[PDB]
Amino acid sequence: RVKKSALPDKEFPIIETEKYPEPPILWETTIGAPSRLFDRSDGVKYV
Amino acid sequence: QSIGGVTPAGVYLYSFALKPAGRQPSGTCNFSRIDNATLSLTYKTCSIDATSPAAVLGNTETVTANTATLLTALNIYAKNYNVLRIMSGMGGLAYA
Amino acid sequence: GGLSQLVAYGAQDVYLTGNPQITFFKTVYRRYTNFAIESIQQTINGSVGFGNKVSTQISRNGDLITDIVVEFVLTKGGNGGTTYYPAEELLQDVELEIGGQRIDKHYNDWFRTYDALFRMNDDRYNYRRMTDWVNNELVGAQKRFYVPLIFFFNQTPGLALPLIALQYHEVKLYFTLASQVQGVNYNGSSAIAGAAQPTMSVWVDYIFLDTQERTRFAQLPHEYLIEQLQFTGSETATPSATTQASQNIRLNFNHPTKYLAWNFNNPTNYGQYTALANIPGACSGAGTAAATVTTPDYGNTGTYNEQLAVLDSAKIQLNGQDRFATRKGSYFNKVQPYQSIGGVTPAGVYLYSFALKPAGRQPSGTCNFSRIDNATLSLTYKTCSIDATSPAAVLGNTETVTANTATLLTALNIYAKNYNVLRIMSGMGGLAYA
Amino acid sequence: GAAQPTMSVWVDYIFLDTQERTRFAQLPHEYLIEQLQFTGSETATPSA
Amino acid sequence: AGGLSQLVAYGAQDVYLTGNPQITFFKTVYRRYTNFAIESIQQTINGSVGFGNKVSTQISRNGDLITDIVVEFVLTKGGNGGTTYYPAEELLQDVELEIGGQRIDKHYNDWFRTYDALFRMNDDRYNYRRMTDWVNNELVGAQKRFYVPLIFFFNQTPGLALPLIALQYHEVKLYFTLASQVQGVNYNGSSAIAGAAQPTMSVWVDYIFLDTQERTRFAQLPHEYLIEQLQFTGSETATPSATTQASQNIRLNFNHPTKYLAWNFNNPTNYGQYTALANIPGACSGAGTAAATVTTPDYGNTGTYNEQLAVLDSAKIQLNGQDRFATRKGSYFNKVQPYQSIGGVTPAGVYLYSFALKPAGRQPSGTCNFSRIDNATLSLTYKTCSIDATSPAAVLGNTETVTANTATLLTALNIYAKNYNVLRIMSGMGGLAYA
Amino acid sequence: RDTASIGFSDTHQDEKTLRFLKKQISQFIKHLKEYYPNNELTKKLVMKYSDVQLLPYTKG
């Protein structure tokens, strides 16, 4: 039995042990193109 | 002309498609390219005494029941075509 | 106007009109082989009468055959409301034989079940007009009824039977006439004195092909993908007021099956698939003092009020495992035909499709029962505790109960429609599968 | 006046240490397990 | 639909907000900081604590740096609820801060009251009141422990913690003067309350313990700090007449870069009274009824926001005879100045004038260096004391330029200035660079 | 959540019938093949494997 101050305190490394069979992906989602915003340029310098 | 069934009173349809009841596109109105689309509606005169069959049934084209003023809600629908893009285990729509 | 819509074109329309493939405004129709159709009457052998078996051989007048109509002249043995599709009831069964071999067979109950599931709207109404009295006709009235046949070649020109290429084999139809027909020669169990015997006729539509098509059919072997009806009768587990009967019915079906169909019935009353009750149309005299729940309103034998149907729920188990999760009888009665047919099915009649479109001719997914060792239909029945003579009980009841009179529905008819291949070669016909 | 039941489902979980947990996640596993088959039947009714 | 519908609505006008992005909001990386701990250590008070006595304490060398200091007092009520007003604050008449014998700063009970009125706010100000007064209607004889935090520059922010660690040869001391009288505790108006208890007292200092690396740095390196000092000049007012508007030019003997000036007019008899009294609720003992005395305040409600009872009509500040700004109304100093510069609410009778953008903060933001102003003067115009304070209608329905007849009791003026000096520490000694 | 496996109940269950028994009996003997599963148990297990199709879908 050891004084608390000399006991380890690190939780089980579950995130280093699970080893999911396949690597994670980038969970891309989308609503698609802004169809009213297609071929519309608002960045015009007055000439 | 466009469906072949019977539509009950109070429900209206305006098709841009030759065959709106089917899946195959057959003419569409692309509102993504219309700056200002508007539906213009004119209502009937609500002068018919709804409690009197003589008035309810013997009336004219431009009038309706006085109880028609209770129809205060309007629901406007539009059914359109988009593309659902699916690939590499994920998907979404082509257009917003 | 319309020009304002044409100009509303964007990137999105690349999937509708960009890089166009077709139009809708210049239809090009296909040219086709020269043909003509003649309606010709057949000779019926044996003796026509109630309960008799008669038959006909189809004459070789044309090259191909399609529609066949069996016509009966019947009279009313009672007043309006006493008959129910009597021409359909009368033709107890029809067997199709080619070259001595059985190809298929339909039953009066199948015609009723088939109609209940696959015909609809005005087609169904016109059908009723051709098999029953529908204008409140009175006793003594005489009508000719037309019962179309529903064999595979009677449904589409595409399957016209090539009599031309069946040179060595005759095509025959054997017809069993019912011993009794409700409202024609019997009223319930009672004979109707003076009732007339039916006059029967069989009409066949023969297609005459021109020379090149005719020659091609005669010289080539042919294969036609056709449907057949499988059918066996079973005893319905008697449903009861105190318990929910259940039953495991082994289905002796084979071949690639499009669908199963079944009904429960009171074998006494043709077309009765539901319990009798004192609610409008549900029994003889319903709604009045004379109402009885021992006899149906024959003219209104079939209903849509599922409360009078016996089946609570069902599933199909294949080789010990479920084919689908258990669903209520109303699933099979209402949803299945919604999903796959689009018509309305009368209470007491059930359908389960293994096919996307069972009502068509093109195969669209089948269950091949020849590869299944054990195909079982598992049925659970409702409890027959509702006093059928009391509308409050008949109409205000729960999901799992039915009429006390539902115990009269002791017959169970299970059907399966499947594909096979009809081979016509060197003048002879037969089937590819057994 | 009867009361409705209160229900709760409890699962007792096994937490493995590092080496065993790794092997379970990565290795294929095969278990011989039991199943219950069951059907209900009508009993022939006996009589006096 | 949903949140993505906002992200997609992107164009040229977004570039100025999100183009070439520099930051995010969703990944906070906290700074690593030096490890430390804070301990509350009781100091020994030398001298007898009691009413009117002067006592002192030397801050012990227990930790490395010091910040907060709290002086505790225990008082017993000499009367019922409503007879006291911040009595712990009133008792601590003044506090003088000295390092090595050099006076660094000095605060007064009135400053604590003015400071609080101007700079603490909302629930903070209430919590403060709870530590200095009886705010739950306590009764005579009730005993209560008060906590009066000091507000010297090192007592307000960790950033100015005084490095006792680098003051190895200098004693750091606090001298505290206790008031001879505290209203509702040992005196009631002009009368002493026989039997009143003498206060107890305790001085608490919060000491910071540093790690080795930080502790070493502090102990040996020179340090330079911007520190705050309070300058204060008390003076007689040009007490307003009931017939006219008194005026006054007050030479301000101030020096150093000044963050702000603040001042109040008061009745020196009644601690915290910055306004006139009247027969309106909260404005006097018995206010609102026949028994009201407009010459005796409701001590528990001494403060007010009713500007009608204030006496400054208008004011300006002159630098070397030149106007620093256009003359503004007393309400401009009372309400707008603190709105702009502090963000709290200032009670009537208390005025602020800032030279800084944000005077309530530590970071300097503009100062008036009075060490370079040969003649700094505050110019005041007072309101006319013609309103009959015993008649609520006379008070509540009057005009801009007038006040209560009882406003002639505001005979004292307290002008404060908060400025910046430089504290330097090296080789164990500390002191202030500028006189 | 984010589960990338099939989970469509069609993964490992040989859902044929007793025709599978005839099929496995169509690879070893004529009538009573019992000696083949009695001896060649490991060969009878190597003759029982599932089809495989993979699809990576890497990161961005």
CB neighbour burial string for E300-320, b if at least 16 within 10 angstroms, e if fewer: bebbbebbbbbbbbbbbbbbe
Closest to C64 (Cα-Cα) out of C41, C44, C36: C36
Do the beta carbons of residue E287 and residue E298 sit within 8 Å?
yes
> Cα(C47)–Cα(C136) distance, rounded to whole angstroms?
31
Q: Which residues of A touch D25 (CB under 8 A)?
A: 17-21
State which H helix or E strand residue C115 sits in: helix C108-118
Amino acid at E76: T
What string of DSSP letters covers C129-175? HTTS--S---TT-EEEEEEE--SGGGT-GGG-EEGGG-TTS-EEEEE
What string of DSSP letters covers E289-357? STT-BTTS--GGG-----GGG--EEEEEEEETTEESS--EEHHIIIIIHHHHHT-S-PPTTEEEEESSS
> Cα(E330)–Cα(E348) distance, rounded to whole angstroms?
9
Q: Which residues of C touch D37 (CB under 8 A)?
A: 320
CB neighbour burial string for A4-36, b if at least 16 within 10 angstroms, e if fewer: eeeeeeeeeeeeebeeeeeeebeeeeebbbbbe
| Exposed/middle/buried for residue E398 (C-beta within 10 Å: 0-12, 13-18, 19+) | middle
Do the beta carbons of residue C262 and residue C414 sit within 8 Å?
yes
Amino acid at C296: P
Which residues face B95 on adjacent strands?
Answer: A33
Read off φ and ψ for residue E168, nearest 5 degrees: -50, -25
Query: What value, to the nearest 5°, has the Cα angle with vertex C294 and ends C288 and C298?
Result: 75
> Cα(E108)–Cα(E178) distance, rounded to whole angstroms?
10
> Cα(C130)–Cα(C70) distance, rounded to whole angstroms?
11
- In a 3-state reduction of DSSP, which class is residue E106? strand
Taking the mean position of all CA atoms in its chain, how far away is CA E29?
A: 37
| Exposed/middle/buried for residue C332 (C-beta within 10 Å: 0-12, 13-18, 19+) | buried
Closest to E350 (Cα-Cα) out of E338, E367, E362: E338
Chains C and F touch (3+ CB pairs under 8 A): yes
- In a 3-state reduction of DSSP, which class is residue E262? strand
Closest to C406 (Cα-Cα) out of C286, C275, C219, C268: C275
The encoded tokens of residue F28 equal: 């070893």
The encoded tokens of residue B20 equal: 């709106």
CA distances from C325 to C334, C400, C415 (A): 17, 18, 21
Amino acid at E257: P
Q: Hey, is the C-beta of A26 within 8 angstroms of any chain B C-beta?
A: no
- Starting at the edge strand found earlier in the chain, the sheet holding C101-107 runs C45-46, C53-57, C171-177, C91-98, C101-107
> Cα(E102)–Cα(E422) distance, rounded to whole angstroms?
13
The encoded tokens of residue B46 equal: 């609500």
Amino acid at F2: D
Q: Which residues of B touch A27 (CB under 8 A)?
A: 90
**Cα four-point dihedral sign C316, C317, C323, C325:** positive
Q: Hey, is the C-beta of B14 within 8 angstroms of any chain C C-beta?
A: no
The encoded tokens of residue E14 equal: 């977004």
Q: What is the DSSP letter of C261?
A: E
Q: Which chains touch B (3 or more CB pairs under 8 A)?
A: A, C, E, F
Q: Hey, is the C-beta of C13 within 8 angstroms of any chain B C-beta?
A: yes
> Cα(D36)–Cα(D32) distance, rounded to whole angstroms?
14
Amino acid at E306: N
- Residue bearing tokens 């009269």: C408
**H-helix segments, C273-410:** 329-330, 336-340, 391-395
> Cα(C48)–Cα(A4) distance, rounded to whole angstroms?
105
The encoded tokens of residue B58 equal: 């013997």
Q: Which residues of B touch C24 (CB under 8 A)?
A: 18, 26
Q: Which chains touch D (3 or more CB pairs under 8 A)?
A: A, C
**CB within 8 A of C243, min separation 6: which ones?**
C383
Read off φ and ψ for residue E406, nearest 5 degrees: -85, 0
Select from E8, E13, E16 the residue whose CB has the most chain A CBs within 10 Å, as the one to mutate to test that interface.
E8
> Cα(A1)–Cα(E293) distance, rounded to whole angstroms?
75
> Cα(E145)–Cα(E152) distance, rounded to whole angstroms?
22
A33 to B92: CB separation less than 8 angstroms, yes or no:
no
CB neighbour burial string for E73-100, b if at least 16 within 10 angstroms, e if fewer: bebbbbbbbebbbbbbbbbbbbbbbbbe
Residue ranges with strand state E in E158-303 = 172-178, 187-188, 191-192, 200-210, 223-236, 247-251, 257-266
Distance from CA of A1 to the nearest CA of C (A): 57
> Cα(E56)–Cα(E65) distance, rounded to whole angstroms?
20
CA distances from C262 to C136, C325, F11, F52 (A): 31, 18, 33, 41
- Residue bearing tokens 């309305």: C344
> Cα(E63)–Cα(E40) distance, rounded to whole angstroms?
10
Which residues face E49 on adjacent strands?
Answer: none
> Cα(E276)–Cα(E404) distance, rounded to whole angstroms?
6
CB neighbour burial string for B44-65, b if at least 16 within 10 angstroms, e if fewer: eeeebeeeeeeeeeebeeeebb
Select from A15, A16, A19, A22 the residue whose CB has the most chain D CBs within 10 Å, as the one to mutate to test that interface.
A19
Do the beta carbons of residue C161 and residue C104 sit within 8 Å?
no
What distance, in Å, lies between the first and last C-alpha atoms of chain F? 20
> Cα(E126)–Cα(E135) distance, rounded to whole angstroms?
9
> Cα(E322)–Cα(E377) distance, rounded to whole angstroms?
10
What string of DSSP letters covers C178-247? PS--BTTTEETTEE-TTPPPPEEEEEEEEEEE-HHHHHHHHHS-EEEEEEEEEEEEEEPPPP-SSS--EE
Do the beta carbons of residue E93 and residue E109 sit within 8 Å?
yes
Q: Are strands B63-65 and B45-48 parallel, antiparallel or unpaired?
A: parallel
What technique solved it? cryo-EM
For A19, which of D15, D17, D26 is closest by C-beta distance?
Answer: D26
What distance, in Å, lies between the first and last C-alpha atoms of chain D? 42
Do the beta carbons of residue C221 and residue C426 sit within 8 Å?
yes
Closest to E92 (Cα-Cα) out of E40, E152, E133, E148: E148
Read off φ and ψ for residue E336, nearest 5 degrees: -85, -50
